[PDB]
Amino acid sequence: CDKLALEKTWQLQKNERLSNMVVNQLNTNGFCIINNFLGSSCSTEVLQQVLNLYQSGVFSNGIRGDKIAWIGGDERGCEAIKYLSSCVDSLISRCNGRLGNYMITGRTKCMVACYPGSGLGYIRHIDNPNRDGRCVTVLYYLNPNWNSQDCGGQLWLYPNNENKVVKIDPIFDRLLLFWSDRRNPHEVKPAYAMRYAITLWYFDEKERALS
Ligand SMILES: [Mn+2]
């Protein structure tokens, strides 16, 4: 994994396809899935670093059954997490100006999360119900060979809070983006194996000022 500075022309063109897809799918449907976002070698390095963090005891309790650690990217042993964040930042930067009226110039740290099996999940909720500044939620999933029929842990998304449910498996190297506000209630269904993911929330500068 070459942890983005000197990408090839073919990679730039792929990256433009990705951002155009994100813009069109967020604006049209309120969410967007990208399969195989980083590739297996780089995704494996992200997962290895997440497990090392988890084994070191730095996670803390996150209604919700997750354990979390906030990673800015400059921590020892987190260079692959930093690389992930740089890739998502570049993706969002290519979309800014095209995502609603939002002015996206910043984000949270990476929220590394584990639902440690045991039937744990997160009930239906809205990430940003109260104008807290967060406009786009980004999930990066890290679970190899995950069969949700056995492992549970699907994300159930309710676009536009209507009757339709979208059931999303938390599969390795999958990126998911969705509007953080009341347009996208969602729930993490109970997990029966250790379930790992990283979340980044991107801010709308004008709303984030409020808090
Ligand atoms: Mn959520």
Residue numbers in the entry: 73 to 75, 78 to 136, 147 to 295
From the reporting publication:
We have found that there is a functional HIFα-PHD-pVHL triad in the simplest animal, T. adhaerens. The HIF system in T. adhaerens is apparently markedly simpler than in humans because it contains only one PHD (TaPHD), and one HIFα isoform with a single ODD (TaODD). The structure of TaPHD contains the conserved double-stranded β-helix core-fold (DSBH, or “jelly roll”-motif), which is present in all characterized 2OG dependent oxygenases, including the human PHDs.
In order to investigate the extent to which the structural features proposed to be necessary for oxygen sensing are conserved between HsPHD2 and TaPHD, we attempted to obtain a crystal structure of TaPHD in complex with Mn(II), a non-reactive substitute for Fe(II), using a TaPHD construct (aa 64-300, TaPHD64-300, MW=29.2 kDa) lacking the N-terminal MYND domain, which could be produced efficiently in Escherichia coli. The shorter construct (TaPHD64-300) yielded crystals that diffracted to 1.2 Å resolution. The substrate-bound and unbound forms of TaPHD crystallized in the P1 and P21 space groups, respectively, reflecting different packing, possibly relating to structural changes in TaPHD induced upon substrate binding. In the TaPHD.Mn structure without TaODD, the manganese ion is octahedrally coordinated by a conserved triad of residues (H209TaPHD, D211TaPHD, and H270TaPHD), an acetate ion, and two water molecules. Deep within the 2OG binding pocket an additional acetate ion forms a salt bridge with R279TaPHD, apparently mimicking 2OG C5 carboxylate binding. Clear differences between the TaPHD.Mn and TaPHD. By contrast, the β7(VI)/β8(V)-loop residue N245TaPHD is not observed in the TaPHD.TaODD structure, unlike in the substrate-unbound TaPHD.Mn structure, in which the electron density of the complete β7(VI)/β8(V)-loop is apparent.
